[PDB]
């Protein structure tokens, strides 16, 4: 599989265009390639302009750009809203620090039979239909991608999530574990398939909170503060679609979003407390306490200074379920020239994160749903760290080559 990521620097453009023809004509040395991707580590200061090009594959057109002097802080968003799709991962099961995440994660529920390679390797277009199948792949993943991250050695300076998202947040923020993580999406799962509540549905809305607060129907309620202007809607279904409906008729902006017949973050869920908040308390023995850097959505800014807020528990996380998401309130914090990664199977957030977010704010995507290649993709949006000055060096997502 010799697909690579290649990385230059130098004092000009053509410096390191030179450079990444030169990576080009020797494709397949991988000794090679591995020194020229140690060698691509040097300061902007000196060597202003960087580029890259993926080697294997055609997302493979070389890019350069100049690198601005200077310290750029690293910020991870993890999504949760439903980013799932038939053949996530697939992809990136090649790198083995992620396939082995993976297995890892199976591990975790070897017992409740599952394997999350099997439902990744599964070819069944329902497969994902089910909340416990979707929730435990979309948190595998997401500690797959934290993984192959952390292994080039980066350390996020901030760490925002997006409902399940929370889970993978903690994993980032040290707080959960690989184990506890995993199982946390299970439950949250199997606790709501159990439940067979009545039939709801969410919906994206181009009003702002406020105006969502005032204008709407009864039993349907504003659920994540995703922008400005932008809120996702929760309720009984009826209710929703009508809403969805009249507002079409007036030119507001109004979006389905699918979710299984589900109100999430909304008081639909509290019948689903009790049970979880059961389950997570054996799971999380002695919680670990957040950190400055995980700025949470489930709490608002005001009770952070807060036992709930203190450490990720079961207590934390069952709240997360229930109460709605203060995504855009989050994003409020994030620094001018800050690079964010949209830690997600596939980047539902995208458009939001550019939309709540400033042009010297740089937003990277490490998946696309049904992307040709996300192997191709990811290895992309490395690539995009390099330009940014993010020092990551991908020979570590590989196997090493020494002594030719």
């Given at each position: 599989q010799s697909m690579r990521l290649l990385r230059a620097s130098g004092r000009t453009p053509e410096a390191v265009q030179k450079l990444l023809e030169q990576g080009l004509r020797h494709s397949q040395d991988l000794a090679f390639l591995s020194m020229l991707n140690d060698i691509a580590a040097v300061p902007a200061t000196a060597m202003p302009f960087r580029g890259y090009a993926v080697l294997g594959g055609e997302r493979g057109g070389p890019e350069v750009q100049q690198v601005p002097a200077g310290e750029r802080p690293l910020w991870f968003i993890c999504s949760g809203m439903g980013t799932q799709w038939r053949g996530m991962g697939l992809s990136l099961m090649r790198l083995d620090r992620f396939r082995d995440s993976i297995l890892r994660s199976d591990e975790a529920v070897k017992p409740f039979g599952l394997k999350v390679s099997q439902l990744l390797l599964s070819t069944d277009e329902s497969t994902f239909d089910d909340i416990v199948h979707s929730f435990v792949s979309l948190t595998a993943i997401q500690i797959g991608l934290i993984d192959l991250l952390s292994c080039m050695g980066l350390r996020p300076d901030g760490i925002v999530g997006h409902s399940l998202g929370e889970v993978a947040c903690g994993y980032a923020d040290g707080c959960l574990s690989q184990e506890e993580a995993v199982l946390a999406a299970y439950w949250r799962g199997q606790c709501i398939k159990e439940a067979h509540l009545p039939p709801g549905a969410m919906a994206a809305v181009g009003l702002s909170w406020e105006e969502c607060k005032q204008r709407c129907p009864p039993g349907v309620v504003p659920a994540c503060h995703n922008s400005k202007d932008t809120v996702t809607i929760s309720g009984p279904q009826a209710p929703v679609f009508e809403f969805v409906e009249q507002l079409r008729k007036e030119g507001v902006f109004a979006k389905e979003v699918r979710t299984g017949g589900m109100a999430?973050?909304?008081?639909?869920?509290?019948?689903?407390?009790?049970?979880?908040?059961?389950?997570?308390?054996?799971?999380?023995?002695?919680?670990?306490?957040?950190?400055?850097?995980?700025?949470?959505?489930?709490?608002?800014?005001?009770?952070?200074?807060?036992?709930?807020?203190?450490?990720?528990?079961?207590?934390?996380?069952?709240?997360?379920?229930?109460?709605?998401?203060?995504?855009?309130?989050?994003?409020?914090?994030?620094?001018?020239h800050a690079v964010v990664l949209e830690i997600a199977p596939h980047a539902l957030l995208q458009a939001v994160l550019k939309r709540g977010l400033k042009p010297s704010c740089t937003i990277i995507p490490l998946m696309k749903k049904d992307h040709r290649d996300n192997l191709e993709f990811f290895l992309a949006g490395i690539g995009r760290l390099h330009l940014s000055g993010i020092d990551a060096n991908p020979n570590a997502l590989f196997p090493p080559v020494e002594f030719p």
């Open positions: 999430f973050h909304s008081y639909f869920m509290e019948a689903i407390a009790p049970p979880l908040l059961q389950e997570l308390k054996k799971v999380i023995r002695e919680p670990k306490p957040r950190s400055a850097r995980w700025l949470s959505t489930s709490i608002p800014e005001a009770q952070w200074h807060s036992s709930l807020a203190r450490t990720s528990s079961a207590e934390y996380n069952v709240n997360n379920l229930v109460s709605p998401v203060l995504f855009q309130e989050a994003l409020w914090h994030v620094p001018e």
